[PDB]
Amino acid sequence: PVDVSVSIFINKIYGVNTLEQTYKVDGYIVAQWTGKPRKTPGDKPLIVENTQIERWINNGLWVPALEFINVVGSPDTGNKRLMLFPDGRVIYNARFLGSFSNDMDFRLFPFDRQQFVLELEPFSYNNQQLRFSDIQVYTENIDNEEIDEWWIRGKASTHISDIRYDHLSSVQPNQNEFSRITVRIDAVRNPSYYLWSFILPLGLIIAASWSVFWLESFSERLQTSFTLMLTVVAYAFYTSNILPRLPYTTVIDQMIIAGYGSIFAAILLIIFAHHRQANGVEDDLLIQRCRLAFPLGFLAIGCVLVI
Amino acid sequence: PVDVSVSIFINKIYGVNTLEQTYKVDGYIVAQWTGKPRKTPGDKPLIVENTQIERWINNGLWVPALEFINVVGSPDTGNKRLMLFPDGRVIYNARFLGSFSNDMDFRLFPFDRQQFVLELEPFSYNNQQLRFSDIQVYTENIDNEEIDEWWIRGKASTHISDIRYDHLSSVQPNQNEFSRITVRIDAVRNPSYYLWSFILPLGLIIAASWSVFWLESFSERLQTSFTLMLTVVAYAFYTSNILPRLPYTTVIDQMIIAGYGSIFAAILLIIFAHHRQANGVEDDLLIQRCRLAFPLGFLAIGCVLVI
Amino acid sequence: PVDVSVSIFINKIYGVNTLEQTYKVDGYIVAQWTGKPRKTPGDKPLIVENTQIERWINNGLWVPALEFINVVGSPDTGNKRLMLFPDGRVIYNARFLGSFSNDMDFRLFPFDRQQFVLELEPFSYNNQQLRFSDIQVYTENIDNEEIDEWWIRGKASTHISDIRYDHLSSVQPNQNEFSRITVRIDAVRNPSYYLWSFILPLGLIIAASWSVFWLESFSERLQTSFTLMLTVVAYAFYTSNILPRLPYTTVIDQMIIAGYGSIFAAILLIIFAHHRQANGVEDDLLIQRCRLAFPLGFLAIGCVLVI
Amino acid sequence: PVDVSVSIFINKIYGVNTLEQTYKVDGYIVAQWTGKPRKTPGDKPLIVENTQIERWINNGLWVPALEFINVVGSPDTGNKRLMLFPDGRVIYNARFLGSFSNDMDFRLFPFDRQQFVLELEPFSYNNQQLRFSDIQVYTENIDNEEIDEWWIRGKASTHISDIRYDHLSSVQPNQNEFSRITVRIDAVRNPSYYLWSFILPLGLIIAASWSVFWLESFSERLQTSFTLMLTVVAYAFYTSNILPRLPYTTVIDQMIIAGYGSIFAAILLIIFAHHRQANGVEDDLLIQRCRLAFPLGFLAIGCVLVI
Amino acid sequence: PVDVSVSIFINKIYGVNTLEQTYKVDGYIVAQWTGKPRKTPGDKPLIVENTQIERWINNGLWVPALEFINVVGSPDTGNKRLMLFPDGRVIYNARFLGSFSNDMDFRLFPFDRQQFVLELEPFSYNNQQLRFSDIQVYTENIDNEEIDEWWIRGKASTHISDIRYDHLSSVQPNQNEFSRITVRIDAVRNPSYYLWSFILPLGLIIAASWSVFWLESFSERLQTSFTLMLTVVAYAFYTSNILPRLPYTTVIDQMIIAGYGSIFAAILLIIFAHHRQANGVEDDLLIQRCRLAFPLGFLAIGCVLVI
């Protein structure tokens, strides 16, 4: 009933792939388990680097394949080493860089929370069980991440449960429960850039759109609308090119629709004000003085987007 | 005439390449077939991991190469294992990530169907036959697809047919029929994002184009048209940059031309309105009152685009 | 002087790189040639799959290297198999996918003609000759290129010629002539998409530009032109991002320049209309009525663009 | 306590990945260390190239794995050679190209300060220490950066420090201190292109925005403001697409937000001038003559962005 | 002091990386050198293809590793063959595809002169020299043609000089001079595409920019200019997106600044014309008649930019 200790050193997470739901993790991994003792050179432990390891297997060294369950494609294995002890126990060490997969919601784009997860599990062993799992990191929050991508409000989160896999259990009846280490790391999106540089300009554009009501004539009002209309389309484009592509509406992406709407609603009022009259051409007394009433109407509906 | 069991675990479909007609499939695959019984260590089945497998072949172990017929390029093979049973039967297991090809129509872009398909067939064996095929997916539709991209409808279509391959049969007369597994999965595109953020703004922009007939003057009418023209071209760009590039007209793309036409037709009326007159000056009294006759004409053309 | 029959199964191409002049080809290749007989297990021919093939070479099996002359970089060799016959003849089979290069003229962009080419020739053999060559495409022209950019044309083209290579021919005097299979498949560009969505709106835009002459004033005429100018600049951008990048002027690219001229010519006329008078301020009575004389002037130069 | 001399020849930096904080370094690396003396063919030193090196290891030649700690994924090892000297000493030479990572502040974008760094450390040895470190570079500052992208202020550097690694350490009590070479090179972004072609055009536009106050009418003033609004949205787009993507506000990114504001502030004054009056419609006599008082207000706040 | 002849067949140059200063070269390379005579099968020369080569080295065949000094990462080695002669001399042939680097000045962007370079040098041998070097190019110009991106001013140059490498000269005292082939090919920029399709439209816009002086009113003049400003920003974006990214100001990039200035300068005159008066509102009679004096002022500054 083989015991396996596991420790995973995390060096770097990088590259969220918003569409494919994919991120890259570089780091090391450690497995420790005790086997039959052997004579080593001297009596100090014997060290085996890279290319040499595969040879020891051909002479009867059992070395379990540890698969990353949730990695997308075999990861980049850097240097790898074995530490064989004269008393038997064996240490497998390897550096990796791999593209891992997990479910993640991006609907709250400028203010995200995400959880990056690793799932390690032996490739073909059910009564070889994973003893304990450990990780690390070295950072400081809240501090220097007005420089950084986002804050890692969060920490370790170890699991290591057992998985059933109820399919073709008759291949080996009664035994198909595999030991799976699961690690998860929480993180929040530093909104600084998307607020200071995206949320703000869009609102001003939407806000400046309302100043159309202070134009004295009607032709002035209506013609200006199409320039404001064009202004939203441009900002919608600048939004879409730079922001990460997604198959749903982000908070920013909804704000873009809010601009498209606010200007189109004015379009209807500007026209309906002209032809809801007592004669033929009269801008309805009290109607064109929604100058500070359209901003109130827009802000009122923009508080139901929150809850 | 060797019998071969096959089981295919499907983990993930992701990243369709609309231009090249290509999608990626990550998962596992299993092959089982019984051969001459042999002595294993103890009497437990023997487990052979990764590199050791290629060695076992050099001692005369026949292991059929199973090629993916519809894969584009050799796939990324992760971990692989053999299970040699003392009673003869052998279970080949490997994790695979590969880019597969299938016919895909994207003309109805925001409302696709589609069928993701696998085709497995031994690389050099016609008597060796595929016994039975199974597929395993652990997803839920419709449910979390507001965070994903696709809705899946079908869920397990399996075939296992036979192929003729009638070329150069005199090399071996009478025998050239191969056993081919066929897996097919139906799926539908989540129209949500392209409606709320692409179909929606485009219609409003096209709709606002019609309000030009409510401009009083003719210089206003004709001059304003050119501003609307620019608005469509801009939105065509924003459409073209973010939407997946294709060599045919999508539904949006047809709606995009619909705008281009409405504006050029409006241009024609606006000018024809001015010089289809009685004497000096008269803008044809009723023709500038197609204010809600141009909207009706467009929706009529937008209902024959559907069927 | 060994004879070698070769047949090339072509599966798909699909991904043209217009700048690098490059297309991808996936398919199979077969080589058959008769050698000294041998004893096979039983008397059935012996099958060798992939890694085992390289083992047979180390025991003196000569397997000629067939190089793709016009492939850019080593192609992806999928599965490969040998067929060793008891009567001597040997069949080499392999699946390939590679990016090939050929000269391709794209000057007539929306209406291209191309020739996709494979060139196979042994890597180091002058008196080992290719017996006869075969090509298996199956597709059905005119038909499905409604969905794929191209259109298949004339199909199979085989040569099997001799090459001189007169440089360092003194390295091996009197013998430097190689047997080269040459495959060529002609193709035409499906213009449907670029017409309905690029050529057509462009014509509408250029046509609408001429309508400036029906604007009454001169300040109106000149001012509106600058909006038309910006409209043309926008369409080049929308064109340039989506269309395939090239180092020469395509047909579309020329049509784009026509707008730049028509507007700049109008700018000059509209201004010259104002200051070609008898008295201070009189728009030359006939010249501003080139309203349907710019439409005629444009079309005359666009039929000398044809020949 | 094995001594190892190290010299790292740097051939090329380049291709900074501003988002991933990543740069590539091409060059050679040399390891020299004296071992048990013996006999070479003749007495000239023995040279072992590439594929041959891997053979020598299996007969007991210890060659330590030198890992690039800050490389992202195993780097590309070009050619490698061993020089075994008859007096014992051995020279390991290999050409490498790998993607290295380091912390990079880009908040000062057009005037960045970065430090590209190598961190070398043995993969599995605690009393085998790095003797001395050398680097070779051959550059000139301030001079060729007319063309080169990077001004260098420092003249390389070398550390060769000690690392604790206080984890896992009871596996080997008393011994867990590793030797790490650190090489660091200072460099700056060179403002020429971003000033002459990005900073300058932005400033001119913001200045021209203020000339809106010199329009006689109010409709002229307010309508034109929306045109300036549209222009800024365009320029933010042109900046964002071409400039390197970052998760924070660069100097340019800050300058962009100021433009968005100046127009919205002008819009408000233009309006407040109109309705901060003695009657109902009088542009407040002094306030619309902030024509050269908005420029003064802009220049004063743009000096607090510096400090 | 072994003599080695080298001949390099060049098949294709393609894919300039303007930022990284990098180009791709596909072709073959040939090495010829005379050694101890050996007995071959029969007396014909023996041919060794690919995988078989590395085996011959392990039996004492010395084959020098030839490194491309300015190649960025180890290149893709296609097929390789040995021709061992009974009289001793040995011919190494291999097809290579690799990414090479060189310094490239792009400041005169649309009209460059460039020099593509290969640099070959043995990896670990100082008294084995390159006898004579030959390369085969077949590049005729002016003619090729009809147009392209570069033209060819020659065929090549062939140094084959001696290198010092003065760092660590005591590794082997008194002998550290290596033989390095240097091949260089000159090329000139085919400007055709960038003139007709980029330079020409800019001039029309810049020329049309001056037509603002023929606008009658001042509100006409000043308001219209803000539209012209937008036109340049649009064109800079379209320029920068399609044109190759660079770290310095191209000729085009300066022409873009020339527009930015001419339009901003017009703004200044247009306003100064209004307030350099005798009464209060009189447009200074001669100054607004710089309509064809600003074209003259602009053309003069574009001729000292030349020298």
UniProtKB/Swiss-Prot annotation, chains A, B, C, D, E:
Its main location: membrane. Residues 1-194, 245-254 are periplasmic. It is a multi-pass membrane protein. A motif (Cys-loop) lies at residues 105-113. The keyword Protein biosynthesis does not apply. Keywords: Cell inner membrane, Cell membrane, Ion channel, Ion transport, Ligand-gated ion channel, Membrane, Receptor, Transmembrane, Transmembrane helix, Transport. Gene3D superfamilies: Neurotransmitter-gated ion-channel ligand-binding domain, Neurotransmitter-gated ion-channel transmembrane domain. SUPFAM superfamilies: Neurotransmitter-gated ion-channel transmembrane pore, Nicotinic receptor ligand binding domain-like. One of its GO terms (molecular function) is extracellular ligand-gated monoatomic ion channel activity. Residues 216-223, 276-291 are cytoplasmic. It comes from the Bacteria. It is found in: Cell inner membrane. The keyword S-adenosyl-L-methionine does not apply. The chain crosses the membrane at residues 195-215, 224-244, 255-275, 292-307. One of its GO terms (cellular component) is plasma membrane. Homopentamer. Belongs to the ligand-gated ion channel (TC 1.A.9) family. Mediates cation-selective currents but does not discriminate between different monovalent cations. This is Cys-loop ligand-gated ion channel. It comes from Dickeya chrysanthemi (Pectobacterium chrysanthemi). The lineage of its organism: Bacteria, Pseudomonadati, Pseudomonadota, Gammaproteobacteria, Enterobacterales.
